[PDB]
Paper text:
Dopamine and its receptors play fundamental roles in controlling neurological processes including motor control, cognition, learning, and emotions. The dopamine receptor family, which belongs to the G-protein-coupled receptor (GPCR) superfamily, can be divided into two subfamilies, namely the D1-like subfamily (including dopamine receptor D1 (DRD1) and DRD5), and the D2-like subfamily (including DRD2, DRD3, and DRD4). DRD4 is characterized by its more selective expression pattern in the brain, and thus exhibits promising pharmacological properties. Although dopamine is the most potent endogenous ligand known to activate DRD4, the receptor is also readily activated by epinephrine and norepinephrine.
Numbering used by the authors:
A (entry chain A): 31 to 135, 144 to 177, 183 to 218, 1001 to 1043, 1059 to 1106, 304 to 378
B (entry chain B): 31 to 136, 144 to 168, 179 to 218, 1001 to 1042, 1056 to 1106, 304 to 379
Amino acid sequence: GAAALVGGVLLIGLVLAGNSLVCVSVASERTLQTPTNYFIVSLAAADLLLAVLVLPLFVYSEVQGGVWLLSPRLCDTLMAMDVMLCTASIWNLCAISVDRFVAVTGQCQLLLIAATWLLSAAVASPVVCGLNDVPGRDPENRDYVVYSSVCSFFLPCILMLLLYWATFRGLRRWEADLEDNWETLNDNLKVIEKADNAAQVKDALTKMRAAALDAQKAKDFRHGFDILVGQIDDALKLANEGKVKEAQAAAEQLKTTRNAYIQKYLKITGRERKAMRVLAVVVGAFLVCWTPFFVVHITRALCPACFVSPRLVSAVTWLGYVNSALNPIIYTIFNAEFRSV
Amino acid sequence: GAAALVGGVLLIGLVLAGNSLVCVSVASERTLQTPTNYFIVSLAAADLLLAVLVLPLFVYSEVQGGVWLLSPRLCDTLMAMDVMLCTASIWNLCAISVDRFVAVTVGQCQLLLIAATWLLSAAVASPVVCGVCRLENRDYVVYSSVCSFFLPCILMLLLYWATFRGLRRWEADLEDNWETLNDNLKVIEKADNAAQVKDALTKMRAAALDAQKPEMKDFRHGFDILVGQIDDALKLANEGKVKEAQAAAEQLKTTRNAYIQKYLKITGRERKAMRVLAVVVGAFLVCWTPFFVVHITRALCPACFVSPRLVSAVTWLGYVNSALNPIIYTIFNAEFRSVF
Ligand SMILES: Clc1ccc(N2CCN(Cc3c[nH]c4ncccc34)CC2)cc1
Ligand SMILES: Clc1ccc(N2CCN(Cc3c[nH]c4ncccc34)CC2)cc1
């Protein structure tokens, strides 16, 4: 019976302690404050707000079985608060995964959070006096629940889908433009070690120094790229002077040098691959826990003579609010970048 | 029950004593005009207003027996005054915590904050115009109990843990620079060729500048002094002279282990300036928590017993914080502690 009591108090306690640390970490440290992390702070503070203006009163309503006792104005304020807060969290996800496009030329990160917070209100603000004191309310409204289920769920869902697909395509294009140089350098070194005349080593060193500039597309990565370019130019000069017998040893030293930075560059490669993975994980948790919710909230409201399942309604509400405590868990146990506890 | 009025009169007298003492100390020191004490003026004003416009008539009622013979419109005016002042006190405590956290995290942008503080204190006291003389409302009661206590309490708690974490990070960064300079100086004492000296001295300069983040100026004067001495050593070293690197490193080590005394004194001063925040916010919570908890409970649990003795006790407990906060400000921090 009172399964919502224990579960509710555990959820509210671990969401009070959950997103609060995400706010105490950024505003304290300086090496971790980024516009991405500022968006994360806005998102977590949005989840911290829902833990008090909705969760306790929602749980107390669920204790009586869902039967409301106070007037209509208080219930309308609490419901509009919940709509604004969920819309704000999902549009904070929107702004976060929009800022996660480093392929763009500090920045005006104010506008994203501001528009998120404004449309969160603008979509949830017009309560029109609880639908104009609709008659026989006794103890949600048409043509507005549909609006707050489309503009607050479906549209940001397609936004997340578009953003992750664009991220996939962009990272694949970046790694392809890098793999071009990856293969050209090996082919040219092989040619140098197997050439026949002074022009073949020259062409191989040309194509080697050619691929050196196509990789400039994005601190210690600078000091590494400046030492081997001089060696490549020395090898090019030696090959220009008809010194293949010396260009071979030059290429041996060049391989021994560049393979020293290979092992430092692949770490950054895996660095960003894991970042994209954790982004996908955050969006996937959002979907997992808020899809059955808004699916029910749109279908049962649009499908009258179809089963709605009261138990399913309460369960999808509990799941959607479990998401509110899932995103600060993902930046915690699923992601190891937030070392400051 | 004569002891009730005795305690009430003593509490009113001590509210007057504490807040008027804050006022007189501000008006007789001239060195208290700092952002730390900038908010205490609003606190003293709000507490004196609570002790003149509520507490006399509040105790009138409390000794009358809760009957209240006053017209319900004057009752609503007094209730609005009490809401406004109890809201202004808590919002100004939140603003104190805000100022502390911002001073930890980074001119005069607190006038807007105090103006909004008192404006919102008035905004929560307006629906009493359209509302026994208790909080005779259900929807409004929860609203005022939530927006005026349940929000600022957790907000200042979060800001206070943020102050703790930021101060710990500042401490850790400066201790890291300390040990980095220790290691680099122990290296230069034993350095061999000149390129290693150049690299290590670049490292030392980088650490010295990375640490650079009435007496806060005397700490930075040693910063630029050490920077200029590192520049001296770097010139004498890149000129191809190894012994002069150590010659300058001797005085650099002297300056380094000399500034640490003032650094640790500053760390102790910051810890002491945060402990007063701890005590103040903790006492405020202890005093003003059960009142609003029982209020929101009685507003959420109608057919649930709330004895009026609880009402009187928690109201006295709430007013105890308005009595105590100037005393707590005077006991801690050496501005008022060393004068008296
Ligand atoms: Cl008697 C009673 C008392 C309180 C409540 N609560 C109010 C807040 N909630 C509304 C809500 C949660 N998620 C949403 N998503 C989109 C649109 C609306 C919502 C639901 C729970 C419900 C019944
Ligand atoms: Cl029969 C009777 C007669 C007079 C009173 N008084 C009215 C003014 N007071 C209201 C009050 C105290 N703290 C608050 N915090 C937030 C909001 C309102 C308040 C309490 C004392 C009470 C009962």
